[PDB]
Amino acid sequence: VAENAGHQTSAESWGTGRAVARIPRVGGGGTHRSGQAAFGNMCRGGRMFAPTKTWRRWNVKVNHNEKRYATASAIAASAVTSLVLARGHRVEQVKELPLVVSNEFESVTKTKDAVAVLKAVGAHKDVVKVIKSKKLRAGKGKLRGRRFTQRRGPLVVYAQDNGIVKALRNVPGVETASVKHLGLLQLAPGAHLGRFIIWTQGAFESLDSVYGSDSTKSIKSGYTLPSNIISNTDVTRLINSAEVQAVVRPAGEKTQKKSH
Amino acid sequence: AKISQDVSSSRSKARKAYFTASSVERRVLLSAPLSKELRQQYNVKSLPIRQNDEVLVVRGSKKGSEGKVNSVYRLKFAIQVDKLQKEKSNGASVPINIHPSKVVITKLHLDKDRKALIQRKGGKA
Amino acid sequence: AISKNLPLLNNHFRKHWQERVRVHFDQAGKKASRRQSRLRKAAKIAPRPIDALRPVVRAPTVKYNRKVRAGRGFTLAELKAVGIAPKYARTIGISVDHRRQNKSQETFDANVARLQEYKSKLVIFDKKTKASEVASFEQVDVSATFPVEQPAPESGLRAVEVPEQTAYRTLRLARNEKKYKGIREKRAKEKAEAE
Amino acid sequence: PTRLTKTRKHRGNVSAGKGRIGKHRKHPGGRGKAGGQHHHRTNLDKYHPGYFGKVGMRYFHKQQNHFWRPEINLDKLWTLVDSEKKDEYLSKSSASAAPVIDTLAHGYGKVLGKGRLPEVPVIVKARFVSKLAEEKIRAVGGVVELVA
RNA sequence: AAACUUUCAACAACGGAUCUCUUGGUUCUCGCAUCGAUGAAGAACGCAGCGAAAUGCGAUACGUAAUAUGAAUUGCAGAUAUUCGUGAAUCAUCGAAUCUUUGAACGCACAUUGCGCCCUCUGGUAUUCCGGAGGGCAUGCCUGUUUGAGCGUCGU
RNA sequence: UGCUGUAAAGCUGGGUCGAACGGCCUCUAGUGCAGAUCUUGGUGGUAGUAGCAAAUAUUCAAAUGAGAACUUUGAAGACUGAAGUGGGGAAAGGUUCCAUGUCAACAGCAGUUGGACAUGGGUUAGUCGAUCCUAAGAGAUGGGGAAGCUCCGUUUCAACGUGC
RNA sequence: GGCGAAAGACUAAUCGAACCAUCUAGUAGCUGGUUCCUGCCGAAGUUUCCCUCAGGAUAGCAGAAGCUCGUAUCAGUUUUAU
RNA sequence: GCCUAGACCGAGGACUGCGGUUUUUACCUAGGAUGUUGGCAUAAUGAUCUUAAGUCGCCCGUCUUGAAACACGGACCAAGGAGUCUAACGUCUAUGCGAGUGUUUGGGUGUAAAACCCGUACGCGUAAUGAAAGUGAACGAAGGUGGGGGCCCAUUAGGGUGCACCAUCGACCGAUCCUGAUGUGUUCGGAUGGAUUUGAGUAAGAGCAUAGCUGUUGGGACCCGAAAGAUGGUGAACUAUGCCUG
RNA sequence: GACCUCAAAUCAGGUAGGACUACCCGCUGAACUUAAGCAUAUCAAUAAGCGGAGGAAAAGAAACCAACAGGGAUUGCCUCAGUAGCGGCGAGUGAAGCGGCAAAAGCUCAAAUUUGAAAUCUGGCGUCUUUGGCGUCCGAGUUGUAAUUUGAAGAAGGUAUCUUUGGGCCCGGCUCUUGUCUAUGUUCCUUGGAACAGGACGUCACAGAGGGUGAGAAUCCCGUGCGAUGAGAUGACCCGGGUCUGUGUAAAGUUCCUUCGACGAGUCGAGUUGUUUGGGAAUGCAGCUCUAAGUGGGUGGUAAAUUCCAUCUAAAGCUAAAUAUUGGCGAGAGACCGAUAGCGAACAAGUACAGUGAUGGAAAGAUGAAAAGAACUUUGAAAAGAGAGUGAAAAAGUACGUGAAAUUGUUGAAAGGGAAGGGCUUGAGAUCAGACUUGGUACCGGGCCAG
């Protein structure tokens, strides 16, 4: 708010003995404003309580290694069909994830051609989902340059941009990104894992150089992919395994019989 | 999506520029599409509406009415067609204001300036 | 106002500090604008480098002797060793410092070597030069092309030579000698002349 | 965020957690370190002994760079050897070819004597050394070389 | 029992909450350097076919010229105003002008529409008296010109 | 109109209405009112109540008008009683002046009347004033102070005529 | 500061020090208020110090988070002995 | 031991149990209610609203030992209305990396305040202690003793190994006191061995960074509230007093 | 008749003042407040007051920092560092050097005999190709105007003979302003007053930002995106080329040798007083007293004498950039506010109005797509009413979107002996609800209340 808002009066308290509250009041006469209360957060036309300041903290630091952890976790989630479906992407007609497309997609220049490629690779139903999702925003956000809302479409990741970026700008919901610069805001929108990702073959091949492997160092200086604290995540099979079942006791009833 | 930093997507700025537009700017703001016949004749898609043009109303309750423009009432952002009237209960009759984007031009009023404008736009006349 | 076990704080906010708050909301904007300024400045004078060649100097302060860094300009003696007049050196992208001196030999040799490398890579144009030759050169980044290099720490293998006196004792004796130097010479002076 | 604070939970309760009797007021007890010798002595003498008074001599225009002398112990000394050649140096060093460790070049001013060295000769270059540190280096057949 | 009072519902009031918007505000960023004696900022008073204000303008007064453009303006009226055109409307653009009485405000004065002086032209039988038109007369300081002052002082 | 929840609350039937809005996972805050002689706005009981009683005093008839205690005319009865309830001015106001029309608001009843409202009209100087003079006093100027805004000096330490 | 045949009178309904704006959201150990529900636990007005006595700090009493263990040795009680 | 009169309740939901009768892998009163009959479904049945009756029920909020108080605020209604943000911190928790850690001052790059990338320094940590000059952490499986979960050998009892943590006796580094060798710029040096002393130390590192609740200090600082104090201006149309002209 | 000093002129030509407020350079200068009192201290070298600028200002090429193996004009950021220090050593306060970065740029006088030539400059007049050139005459100026030099040097004499060359003009580029030009449905059905809604079939897309149009419009309009193509300015102080003069015994640059090498005074410095600073036997500033020197002078964070060492070179001057910016001008934005909010003001808002004055200072947004703003008849003095009419709607009538509550009228139901209201319980009156199931093929079977 303005630094002087609610403070552009010369009001003084009347004191006590005049049968009114001790809040400061506008002096003078001849106008309806005279004698009215001022300055107080409870007063009409006063200043608000604890006025908002610009030196509030707006940006937040995150450790760079932890941010990279999150990026890798988001990329790994994009290959799990259950997370991609629960994310809300219409990926039921794609045989396998990751969806990798030949590098000629990188050289597509016209929007019509790019949409044809999306239809051929079975990705256009998610685009149609974006088209039929457009709605006027609820509330006062529409007064502030945020008039419409729609779903997120697929993310298309390339290694060389020979016209693919411009061919795909106008398509509603579709986002493009270089494999060199992949970020969480595109990879897990709303903090929800499982973005529908279309890789060109070049980008899919560059992934191993970008993030490294057990036989390739990351181009990222001093960086290695994280390790899990568990190696076999299929706990039920570990429990129902010969090694474990050979030391346990017999199991009781699932529910105890009532005895009294 | 827009790219130029000289272009604003602000709603308030756009509305203020629209409602405070001068008469000269309102002339271009009040453009009407040509019919398919005149579009093939002149190779121009839209022109600013003019007084002695002839129009077909294609939207609203007066859709299908044809007439010659009597006045481009630029102050009211509307045109007035010759016999598209509304008769009051007292017998007097008033024109029906129609926005130019809701009609198609059927016949152009031509002079040197309209012809030069048509040639500028890549058209033929 | 003093209470439970807590560090005693020094928060200096008893003046009208809110009238003097600077929030760098323009950090990204100034980055982009400073970048555009560098771009235009380089395009104006291409293919001449933007940066003058700078010398290599030791850093002062026993905390920073081990380090070497870029200095302000080459000394008059260093340029004299290469045969370049001070007023001419400023027109061919070489920084000059009339204030720095050359007491030792090591830094002098390092900067003479830098000047010779730069002058060997230098190509001056004239009226006889055609635009085909000029267009054949790219705008070199002088700071990157002639970087400041730390002399390496001694590594590898070497024979072990053990003096009879320990290094600790050497340090102790040096300290003692310095500490009593003033009074031992005074005892000497007052004794030799009297005897 | 504000939705997690106890201010939200105190809504509807008269005193906002500040009590009816005590009645949270402006500055009961003073501001800052007020009364450290009078009514806050019972706090300062318990949790901050040594607070009041002067000890030692003044030093006008102290320059911290004069006293720069980071310490490295013997048990950490071999981290300064090139990691690619550490295993080779341990097996091959002798009185004729011993590794040289430039402690000053790595950012250290004095070598201290905590811990145990590998039984391998080493040439240690340092500005300063402790008495025990040099004895342990000389006991594994090495030497300390003073630099400046 | 009515009237009266009280409770509820329905409709009608009183009043302007709620909801929905918004040519406004607020904050951040980016770019730029341009007031005035060549009379500024500000003030007073006027100016339209029909206007009180706001907006604009200055007795050339909701404006003149120029350039661009190309058919309106509009609440009503209206041309000796216009349409294949030196041409409707246009603070669209703007480089030429006009710019009352003032204001740092400058002949003096100012709670006055008060009072001089100078030049050129002009009316009244006029170098003087009375009238009109146009053009001038502030202070501090600098450079220069001209006219001077002082036994301050040189020489003849 | 009902339903769910211990509850904060949530859902639904009917009526009104006219342009946006909600559930779920998260983020965020200028986030929940009965009180503060709280703030602003609105509205009651009191209550058709207190009251509309200083300055001697009004009446008959006619006209007008939809309408007359209150307007106009006539006839009376009165009063101010020249130290006026008469005739003018200074200060202050600023069109209140006059004619015509007009009654929503205002004239603490009324209103056909009005200093109200609307439309027009109206203020003529050689001789009456201002303008000029000086009064107590105010105040420029060579100047002397003061960091300076400015202060001081006017019989003013001055080569001071825009002379006759 | 004025002015006072003097009352602390008068200085624009303001006078034992005018009015106006700003410093200024001046400070208050003092008065008033302090906005949804349910669930569990649950006090103190006592010690020491303080220009301390309507206020603080300090200990006590209370909540929360737990952690190391799993019947070890504990008790606002008795008995025997002293 | 037996006979006999009433009331309230019916939780659970295949079997599994303990017993009993034994006539029998059957039956029971024995790990919680079933059988049968009538009426009704245009309805008795239940719930809410209004009202009558019976019984109980002082006005909320607040300060207080004590309020319905003859204590204070509150005529009524709507809308507004009070622990916030920031700098620097304590504890705890989550997360990343870990003897390190922190990209964001800056540079690179960009789909352009985003996202992505880069490194020198620096901060904090990795060493303490003393006013300071200065000195600076292994006798030993990083020690001995008593406990100690878990693990191991056994076989209940027993033996072994025992991290974290606890009690205790030592050892190492700095300060303090004493002793005082070989030697010397003969006044320095300080070997060595002692002392009911002392440190926010060592004795196989634990930290750095981001975020959250709570607590702390400075800020208008939960909201409203003085009597005052200061700086710069405006008034003698009222009134006080002098003067000038009526 | 000169000169010096001092005057005058409506003398020829100029210049200054005043405004604005965010940032900038100085002067002057509080108190509230904190210290739980209070006087030093703090607030604060802050507010208020005064003088002076610009697009930035200021600062700036060491009388510096240092004590190192040395750095090297100024400014800013990060760090140094809540540290050294200051402080009723209390409350509090508090820099600098180094290091990493942003930006980088360097220089000008005075002090010198041109002395074989005042070589310099304002003005008048004439003239031209006019931000000026040429000619000429006065004037200024020797009490010193040009060339030459600025300590990093440099000068005057020799040098190896080596290296370079100035300006006036024309077209370009770049830079700035500005004109013109641009894809694809308004196809069919349904709802509606209106299609911009839904459904069907499509199209463009380097354009699915935003706005308008009778409801949510990529495809109706303007735009958006992508480029294409003209015009006009401006730049000693940006460069790509031409061009005539190149008066090149002229200017300048380098190396070496010799002799030299001027370097700022009531200033430095000292004492004292006041103020200020982190600056502590005194950090800066200012007043007064004293008052220098020439390997001298300053500084080297504890006063003094003696001896060294280090490092600069004051008392004269100019200078872009990185830095600041609640003002001005032009733009783009937001997890901001949404008419008691947000600026005081979304409106004829610093308006109406108040005060002698300084000053103080509101309230107030929305009919409808379109006035289609209700012709006409009738009752009435009129305002109005009743019919009618317009409209999708008058449950939209310029008392106009929706239209809550307090409070009020009418209608209906009910209750009532000095308050009313509440809880519990049941009766009465009203309302609501359900199993004859989504029942099964006259029977089977089920729901509810009861014996």
Ligand SMILES: CN[C@@H]1[C@@H](O)[C@@H](O[C@@H]2[C@@H](O)[C@H](O[C@H]3O[C@H]([C@@H](C)O)[C@@H](O)[C@H](O)[C@H]3N)[C@@H](N)C[C@H]2N)OC[C@]1(C)O
């Ligand atoms: C930068 N703002 C501009 C705004 O000024 C305006 O620009 C007009 C532009 O629309 C006109 O151009 C328009 O009108 C012409 C013609 C009918 O005049 C048409 O031929 C043309 O297609 C159409 N774009 C152009 N002739 C002048 C600009 N100032 O229109 C909007 C805009 C393009 O954004």
Ligand SMILES: CN[C@@H]1[C@@H](O)[C@@H](O[C@@H]2[C@@H](O)[C@H](O[C@H]3O[C@H]([C@@H](C)O)[C@@H](O)[C@H](O)[C@H]3N)[C@@H](N)C[C@H]2N)OC[C@]1(C)O
């Ligand atoms: C020492 N210098 C003095 C200088 O001070 C001055 O003297 C004045 C003198 O002129 C004044 O006197 C002057 O000024 C006064 C005026 C002030 O009223 C006049 O009345 C008087 O006539 C006149 N002579 C005298 N009153 C004071 C001296 N210091 O003039 C004379 C002088 C010799 O030059």
Ligand SMILES: CN[C@@H]1[C@@H](O)[C@@H](O[C@@H]2[C@@H](O)[C@H](O[C@H]3O[C@H]([C@@H](C)O)[C@@H](O)[C@H](O)[C@H]3N)[C@@H](N)C[C@H]2N)OC[C@]1(C)O
């Ligand atoms: C084992 N007992 C020792 C006890 O003997 C003593 O040791 C001293 C030690 O203090 C002396 O050492 C002392 O003096 C020397 C200086 C002289 O060089 C200093 O360097 C050192 O810092 C200082 N502590 C040492 N020189 C002799 C030992 N016996 O130190 C304390 C102790 C640990 O208790």
Ligand SMILES: CN[C@@H]1[C@@H](O)[C@@H](O[C@@H]2[C@@H](O)[C@H](O[C@H]3O[C@H]([C@@H](C)O)[C@@H](O)[C@H](O)[C@H]3N)[C@@H](N)C[C@H]2N)OC[C@]1(C)O
């Ligand atoms: C010189 N005499 C010593 C005597 O002083 C003592 O030595 C102490 C020792 O006990 C202290 O040690 C004590 O305190 C340290 C703590 C401070 O870190 C603990 O770690 C340690 O367990 C504890 N015993 C040690 N800090 C200093 C020695 N002089 O030990 C006994 C003795 C040998 O007689």
Ligand SMILES: CN[C@@H]1[C@@H](O)[C@@H](O[C@@H]2[C@@H](O)[C@H](O[C@H]3O[C@H]([C@@H](C)O)[C@@H](O)[C@H](O)[C@H]3N)[C@@H](N)C[C@H]2N)OC[C@]1(C)O
């Ligand atoms: C396994 N070896 C251990 C070694 O690790 C170390 O152990 C310490 C132990 O001594 C410390 O304990 C020590 O210091 C603490 C302290 C609080 O003062 C005291 O209890 C006491 O002085 C002393 N026991 C303990 N706090 C941590 C262990 N790691 O101490 C030596 C040792 C006991 O030999």
Ligand SMILES: CN[C@@H]1[C@@H](O)[C@@H](O[C@@H]2[C@@H](O)[C@H](O[C@H]3O[C@H]([C@@H](C)O)[C@@H](O)[C@H](O)[C@H]3N)[C@@H](N)C[C@H]2N)OC[C@]1(C)O
């Ligand atoms: C006819 N009287 C005029 C009139 O212009 C009046 O307008 C109000 C108008 O503001 C109201 O309309 C209102 O609409 C919303 C909502 C609360 O209704 C308000 O928030 C908004 O302020 C206002 N525009 C409208 N409902 C009634 C008219 N008399 O406002 C001023 C006035 C003098 O009273």
Ligand SMILES: [NH3+]CCC[NH2+]CCCC[NH2+]CCC[NH3+]
């Ligand atoms: N801003 C405060 C202005 C007044 N100055 C007071 C502080 C001066 C410091 N004095 C400290 C003692 C002297 N060394």
